[PDB]
Amino acid sequence: GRKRKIDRDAVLNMWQQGLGASHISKTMNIARSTVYKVINESN
């Protein structure tokens, strides 16, 4: 599906609010390099 069962607002907030690798992880639930696994996907 497209927007049925998938996340997006989670990482969309940890980056679009003003964070950086380490500070982004403390705000959400994932390390900074793991976070870039997402940012790279551009999903």
C-alpha positions as a LaTeX table, in Angstrom:
\begin{tabular}{lrrr}
\hline
Residue & $x$ (\AA) & $y$ (\AA) & $z$ (\AA) \\
\hline
Gly1 & 0.00 & 0.00 & 0.00 \\
Arg2 & 1.09 & 3.67 & $-0.18$ \\
Lys3 & 0.01 & 5.43 & 3.04 \\
Arg4 & $-1.76$ & 2.47 & 4.70 \\
Lys5 & 0.55 & 0.77 & 7.24 \\
Ile6 & 3.84 & 2.72 & 7.11 \\
Asp7 & 5.63 & 5.32 & 9.28 \\
Arg8 & 6.92 & 8.70 & 8.03 \\
Asp9 & 6.02 & 11.44 & 10.56 \\
Ala10 & 8.55 & 9.95 & 13.03 \\
Val11 & 11.76 & 10.67 & 11.06 \\
Leu12 & 10.01 & 13.63 & 9.37 \\
Asn13 & 9.93 & 15.33 & 12.81 \\
Met14 & 13.38 & 14.39 & 14.13 \\
Trp15 & 14.91 & 16.11 & 11.03 \\
Gln16 & 12.48 & 18.83 & 10.01 \\
Gln17 & 12.53 & 20.31 & 13.56 \\
Gly18 & 16.31 & 20.93 & 13.72 \\
Leu19 & 18.46 & 18.02 & 14.98 \\
Gly20 & 21.75 & 16.28 & 14.15 \\
Ala21 & 22.72 & 12.54 & 14.18 \\
Ser22 & 23.19 & 12.12 & 17.98 \\
His23 & 20.59 & 14.72 & 19.04 \\
Ile24 & 18.16 & 13.15 & 16.50 \\
Ser25 & 18.50 & 9.68 & 18.11 \\
Lys26 & 17.84 & 10.99 & 21.65 \\
Thr27 & 14.66 & 12.62 & 20.28 \\
Met28 & 13.36 & 9.46 & 18.53 \\
Asn29 & 14.17 & 5.74 & 19.03 \\
Ile30 & 17.12 & 5.03 & 16.63 \\
Ala31 & 20.91 & 5.64 & 16.46 \\
Arg32 & 22.29 & 8.36 & 14.15 \\
Ser33 & 23.78 & 6.03 & 11.49 \\
Thr34 & 20.55 & 3.98 & 11.55 \\
Val35 & 18.69 & 7.26 & 11.08 \\
Tyr36 & 20.71 & 7.86 & 7.89 \\
Lys37 & 19.61 & 4.45 & 6.61 \\
Val38 & 16.26 & 6.27 & 6.41 \\
Ile39 & 17.45 & 9.71 & 5.14 \\
Asn40 & 19.25 & 7.89 & 2.34 \\
Glu41 & 16.13 & 5.92 & 1.35 \\
Ser42 & 14.29 & 9.26 & 0.88 \\
Asn43 & 11.02 & 7.34 & 1.38 \\
\hline
\end{tabular}
